[PDB]
Design a protein around this ligand. Sequence first.
Ligand SMILES: OC[C@H]1O[C@@H](O)[C@H](O)[C@@H](O)[C@H]1O
Ligand SMILES: OC[C@H]1O[C@@H](O)[C@H](O)[C@@H](O)[C@H]1O
Ligand SMILES: OC[C@H]1O[C@@H](O)[C@H](O)[C@@H](O)[C@H]1O
Ligand SMILES: OC[C@H]1O[C@@H](O)[C@H](O)[C@@H](O)[C@H]1O
Ligand SMILES: OC[C@H]1O[C@@H](O)[C@H](O)[C@@H](O)[C@H]1O
Ligand SMILES: OC[C@H]1O[C@@H](O)[C@H](O)[C@@H](O)[C@H]1O
Ligand code: NA
Ligand code: NA
Lengths: 987, 987
Amino acid sequence: SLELGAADIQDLESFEAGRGALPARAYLQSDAPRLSLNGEWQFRLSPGSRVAPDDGWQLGEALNGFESLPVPSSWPMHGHGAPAYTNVQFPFAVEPPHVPEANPIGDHLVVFEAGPEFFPHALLRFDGIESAGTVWLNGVELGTTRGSRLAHEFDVSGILEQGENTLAVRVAQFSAASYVEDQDMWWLPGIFRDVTLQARPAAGIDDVFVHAGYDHITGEGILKVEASRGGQAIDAVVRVPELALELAAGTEVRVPAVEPWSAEVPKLYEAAVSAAGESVALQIGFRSIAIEDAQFKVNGRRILLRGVNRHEHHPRLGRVVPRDVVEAELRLMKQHNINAIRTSHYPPHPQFLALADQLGFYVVLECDLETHGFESAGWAQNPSDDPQWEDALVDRMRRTVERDKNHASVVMWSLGNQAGTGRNLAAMSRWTKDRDPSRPIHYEGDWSSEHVDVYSRMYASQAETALIGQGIEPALNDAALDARRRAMPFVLCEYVHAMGNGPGGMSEYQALFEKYPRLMGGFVWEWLEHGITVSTADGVDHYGYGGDFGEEVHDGNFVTDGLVDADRRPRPGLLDFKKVIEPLRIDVARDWTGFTLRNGQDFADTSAFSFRYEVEADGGALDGGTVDVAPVAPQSETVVELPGSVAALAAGLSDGRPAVLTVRAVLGADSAWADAGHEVAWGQSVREPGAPVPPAPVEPVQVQDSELTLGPVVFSRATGMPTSIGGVPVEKLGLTLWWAPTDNDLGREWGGADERPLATQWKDAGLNRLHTRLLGISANPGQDGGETLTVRTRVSAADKQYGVLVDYTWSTDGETVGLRTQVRRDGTWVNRGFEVEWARIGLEFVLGEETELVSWFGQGPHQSYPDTGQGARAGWFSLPLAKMDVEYVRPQECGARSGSRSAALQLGGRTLEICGDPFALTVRPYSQDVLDAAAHRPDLKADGRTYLYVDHALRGVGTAACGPGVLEQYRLKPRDADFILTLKVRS
Amino acid sequence: SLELGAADIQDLESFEAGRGALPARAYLQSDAPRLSLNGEWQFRLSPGSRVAPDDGWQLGEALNGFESLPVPSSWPMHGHGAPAYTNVQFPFAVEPPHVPEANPIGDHLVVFEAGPEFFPHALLRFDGIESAGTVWLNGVELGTTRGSRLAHEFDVSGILEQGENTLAVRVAQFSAASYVEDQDMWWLPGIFRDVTLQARPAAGIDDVFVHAGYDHITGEGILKVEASRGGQAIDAVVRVPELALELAAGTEVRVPAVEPWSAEVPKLYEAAVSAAGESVALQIGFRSIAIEDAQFKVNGRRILLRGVNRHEHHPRLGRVVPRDVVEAELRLMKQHNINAIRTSHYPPHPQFLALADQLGFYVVLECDLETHGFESAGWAQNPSDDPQWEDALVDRMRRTVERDKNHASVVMWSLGNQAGTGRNLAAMSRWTKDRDPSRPIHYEGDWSSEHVDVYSRMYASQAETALIGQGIEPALNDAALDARRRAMPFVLCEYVHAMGNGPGGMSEYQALFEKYPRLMGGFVWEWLEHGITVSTADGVDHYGYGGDFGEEVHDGNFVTDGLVDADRRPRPGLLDFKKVIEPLRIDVARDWTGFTLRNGQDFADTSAFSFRYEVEADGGALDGGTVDVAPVAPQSETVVELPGSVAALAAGLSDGRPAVLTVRAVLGADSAWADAGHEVAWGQSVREPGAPVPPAPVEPVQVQDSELTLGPVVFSRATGMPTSIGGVPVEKLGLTLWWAPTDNDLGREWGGADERPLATQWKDAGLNRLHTRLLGISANPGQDGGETLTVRTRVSAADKQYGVLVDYTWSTDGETVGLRTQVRRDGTWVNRGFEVEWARIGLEFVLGEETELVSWFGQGPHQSYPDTGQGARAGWFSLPLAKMDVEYVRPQECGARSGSRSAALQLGGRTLEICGDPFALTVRPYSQDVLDAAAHRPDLKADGRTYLYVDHALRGVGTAACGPGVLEQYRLKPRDADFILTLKVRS
Ligand SMILES: OC[C@H]1O[C@@H](O)[C@H](O)[C@@H](O)[C@H]1O
Ligand SMILES: OC[C@H]1O[C@@H](O)[C@H](O)[C@@H](O)[C@H]1O
Ligand SMILES: OC[C@H]1O[C@@H](O)[C@H](O)[C@@H](O)[C@H]1O
Ligand SMILES: OC[C@H]1O[C@@H](O)[C@H](O)[C@@H](O)[C@H]1O
Ligand SMILES: OC[C@H]1O[C@@H](O)[C@H](O)[C@@H](O)[C@H]1O
Ligand SMILES: OC[C@H]1O[C@@H](O)[C@H](O)[C@@H](O)[C@H]1O
Ligand code: NA
Ligand code: NA
């Protein structure tokens, strides 16, 4: 046997959960001496095990080949190799437990000093190594690590020396464990969480298990704090000063009056558990979880989960998320009405849990297990059902549960994600139910729900969710399993996939969640885009995605699918989500005399809020103030009268003049997660402006050799299009039916005979390449010598027989211009046997000047499409042109402002004003073809023109990249249509 | 009505066949004064009719805007606009008769002088204008032209002036006629054929209709020459000196003994038809065409059509083909055994016909009509069935027939191509049968064959062709039409689509053509690639195809689909086609005592040929000479004994020594189309070399720290691959299963549930991204202390569970190296529910040095794949590395030499020699990934290495880009396999 590296590879191919580590336990704050070994280490990278040197480097001998590297790190974020993104597909041949030859091996070394406080006993702790570590101290092998996002501790007693010590860690990127770590995220090897030396004094405390329940009938807490050392229960004293408690560890007591913990009111009691040689500090939240009457209840009440799936990602550091970024992102979540987090799909940094306890989130704490890449082979060889993997998978669940079991915020344990079904998942569930019956078990992969306590799905349609909400879904074949599942509450562990422009359809889910007790709510996929900061050859920073790092196989921009970008800047979807899930409902009366207020919270009343009103008109705010609202109980409602000055204004306003009344609930005082005045909920009542009044057509058409003039409009006799309006140059005017496909439009809409993505349907139909033929131009008699001008055109595409006849009728009184557009289908819009849907029915004006500022009356400030824009409120808005865009990583259709009634574009020294019945407004400095072709933001370039889109109709954006497409009510099928606009130019 | 250009556009949208032209007539060589107006004209281009100036330019006033342009020309070939390629799809919206707004309008002007010989009567002739011309002379509008490849003449009597004249022609690229001119070719506007002034003397001859039949029973000619002036029969004298004839025009006579015309023996008789004021010169070929007993017969005998489809294209001049290029390409066709031409899909230059008469080709002369782009809408609005188009389509057929009716080479009239079915095609057929019953009518678009005389198909499979050949195809529903069609002879007007590497499957068609009298033969699609010469930014010339000229819609490289490149350089397909269709069959006896000879000609005996033999061995020619063969009658065979010295050599050769006997039929004397010694047919008998003798394994394996040595081979202990063989550096050795997709592999194979192109099947299966895992390396006991080395590997792809186990066993005696490769499937090669076919089972050696010369024993000199290579004969070959490649316009798999038994690569100062049972040999200076990624030849770059492919199995190439894919016998399904090679390095 002559090949090199055989012993290293046999270890990497092991089915065992590693070796040599101390038993799994909780992460505990203790007074035992602690030394962090994080800092600058030495690092050497080899391309695989067979060439990784065996040169005594573990002693500090072979310094050459090594260079400085920060630890913790994801090493490809620091110039060593490259990140690689795959969604489902494995990046290596699927033949478990074997590893590919190209397998980056990273050797890490650090020298540190240990004082006498670390003797006689100490351990070394590793909070995360992706994916396989072998650890040596002073040349002695301590053992190995498996379970990339799980903690391992090694006893160093008798190996650690007083004074200098040399720690060496060989990390393999790929191992047998990679087959059970196939999450949809970047593959990033490294020692990516804390490395800590901890003294283990005699008569200490190794593990603690807090049991802190709440009896909602009596208001009592139920407390038992177990404590152990070396696997044996120990005498220890538990002190909870705020509750006047001093009790023995291991005894259950009833605490007469506790304030219970919830995400809404995250009450924590400081406690200490003390033995002779060590004391542990705890924060105890009293809460009990129950499943009863097909409802998920906390402290005796059904709750509504307004959730996100949170991965750990940083655009420059990879899987290392600095604490300040964590704290800020959790506050950002609370600022957007989120109350729940799923740790997709592995345990988070150990210090995350205390922050969730403190700020208040219901947490689904998920084990590091995902075998999704076996699905393509019908789950053949799936680790979850293979006996050889049982110990490894039970170990993952054990380490997951033991680490985080003391945290009130953890309300459910999840077995993993997309791991199929099998005997080892059942073993993990059995182990967990025996160890910790206080928390229900979650796992979506087995729809029969045989081994879980809630029924979980991902991306079930709104329609199917309504059936489940009513308890009327189709039955499982096994009547006993059906009876069990039908009596379970239902959660969407992933829904409304938030990739690109979207997600559409959030309101339809939310109405169901709020109506049906069996529906627990849902967790958006996902909180963040995993963009990675890169730069062009000219130094322009932007986010990269799959394939931008030379990957042979990858899934492109499916890793940029979040509510916020990788720097935690909100996408429009987050602003809409905040509104959709707002925990108070404010319904303002049409007559402005008051509002109905529903408190949708589960535990808190409305006393935390200040209720403010404001009336705005074109000239600015006409009135505003606060109203005193007697606190409304959870799940109750009331009617609140507004001050008489508000209704007096409504009465006084001349009909047709626009005005907006907004009632908002803001924090009355600072909280831990936002300042006083932070807006939580709002409602409005709008007095809409009258429809536009087209001008009397009293100006005649003047005929020149090559142009026509009609008041302030000049037209080409060769094209029929305006070439200037009030001196604003017009390069082109034409009909639009298409937009640059969103990420959702690039997804297949399964079901029905046509499974092409909408983008492909449009391409095949030629909708991305429309052309216009001029049929004729004629003047018609107007008023008092004036005339109208009708330009007749037909729009179609090369090689197609279908078209739309489009007639433009122009009129003017010399100041205002009227434009009537009439669209009539000429032939059936069917291509390849299927109907061709449209993106819009609108006009594109290409103006020969740049726009500095865009103002409008409608909704805003951010974009809105028919099935989004919940967060866009009625009002007057004004933005610099650059701020109208949306910085999606892959540029795509975005930035439309639906529901507009008037718009004004400042183009140098002139203002172009447009009025209509509701229209969508978009303004860009580059064309739709530039937007479509661009794969990253630096591909966009301004060309000196203004591209102005006025849409009479728009389709929705849906979630077709993963889950439901556009719901029927928001689809735009071909139709005939007519609409009027008025235009004016002010100088 | 205020738009510009309305009158011009109404004319362009006219359904009429133009206006003002003289009646259609023959192209006739006459003694009337003729002046060619070809030369340097003045030219101005506008983007459409609405902006095309009406500035009096027709008089020579508006010189500015005009620049010099050669006429004839295709104007986009001279920097004015750009060529655009579409196959089927129209490049404009389909709404006949309307034209798009973007419609290049080219104004052409020339001043010329006319002497007194052009008075009182003269005409102007235009032999082609694409697509719509309006003609003025001295400011007077003569009329308009429709039918782009048809001739028009205009009377200029009373308009032409003695002295200076100004001719003006406005040409529109697009018109209503574009809807009936949708051939698969470049769209190229221009005045692209001759412009001629012709005097029309009094008492002259306007038209002549030659009728020249042949009675094969008596050997007599049947002659009648009709002559007319102004539509009336005239007295004229017909003189045929070689036949001693002086007769009146309009009288039918029997000529006692004529030598008949055929493509094989194109006998022409010079004749003159003379009236008082004009004489016409003719070449008369006597031949009669008959359909009888379901056979197409000429001069009483069934013929076999060995044909090509000939478009008119030049890579720098467009639709203008210089006469010297025409003459050379026709000789090239004859040099490759072609005897028939289809003028796809329009009449050729008028002077082509005399060349076909003279050189000898059976011509299918096809009308300028193709409406293929209406098929996508179910033929809705198809001009062929629309009454408004009747006059226009009958006019096209009339002009087609009248121009060329006097030519013996025209044996069938074709109505057009891919024009669907309809009443106007029936009208065209009726008109033609009435006007010229001497020629059968062809049209493939109506499979019922109701209005034609032969049954024509395009790309019918070999299987379906065999059924038709036997008269057993499924019946038409109408019993009367079925009886008619079943009694028709059958032609493939297009078959064996010759795009890229291919066409495969030619032999299977040819065997049927030769076996079944009803099968007339076939015309390859197509003679030439329509490449257009372009240059890179660095000045590297190459051919461009669709999309290389900025087209919005195009069909890519489907215009480069020929047997020769646009400069008439043969592709390998032409060399194979020549052999497939060779008109003599030479079957050499295994014992080298003689050969059987079949004369497959229809009229000629074998007296034109010299029969030569040659015996070659490794050292060179051992013997050769000529053998006297008594002339063999058409369709007969004989046995010919070879000189005894040949068999004496065979007897004397030691068994296992290779030797090749080749018998060839060459021209004994110069012909009009090739020189004496030109090879027409050949056959061989091969004494094959013995199988390779692997060495005695008497050298042991020497183990070093990181390498192993086994005689002259060094191996890496990290990869198991050789790193040098005899000092030749080896960068990589591995198994191959894939090749860079050919044009055929990018085509869909219709039928069955899987219609992905093979290239897509491979991509989805990961066959283009295989990786290898090392399982182990071990030494085994050899002989007398020696050892063998077995390297065990597994080949698979990321995210797939299927693989192949590949074991390499190495042995050496210190000079020769033995390599045994064993391949075993591990799991089923099924992906997306369908079996994954392989391109090959072979080895790729990547050598770290450049190869200067490649030599081999096998077949050659050109490439061969399992279903091609008919033209590659057995022998010894040697080529510089560059000449091993094939210069396809889109680079793709090519250059394999199948059937090799030994190869030698000269790499600097060393020669690497390889021996095996039959293997395919390929050698390249760039990798397969470079070949696949390259879209044009300058994308290929040498990297300083040698890529050597040794294939134990290869799949065929088929014709799946259009028509049959690889036939079952040539497909390569996954299998287990083993094979032996020997290697030696000589310094
Ligand atoms: O777990 C390791 C990480 O822990 C975070 O809390 C810290 O802010 C980061 O800098 C890094 O050290
Ligand atoms: O003010 C900036 C941000 O800071 C928070 O503290 C505040 O409460 C939020 O509403 C947000 O506006
Ligand atoms: O009359 C203006 C027209 O210009 C053409 O160049 C274009 O193809 C048409 O779609 C239309 O825009
Ligand atoms: O028909 C026009 C063409 O005719 C060819 O015979 C000639 O060689 C070309 O130069 C061009 O004049
Ligand atoms: O010799 C060059 C070429 O020229 C032809 O005249 C000859 O007959 C052909 O066989 C070809 O070889
Ligand atoms: O042992 C050599 C190997 O090297 C790796 O880098 C490659 O992925 C494998 O396919 C194989 O070539
Ligand atoms: Na884009
Ligand atoms: Na290629």
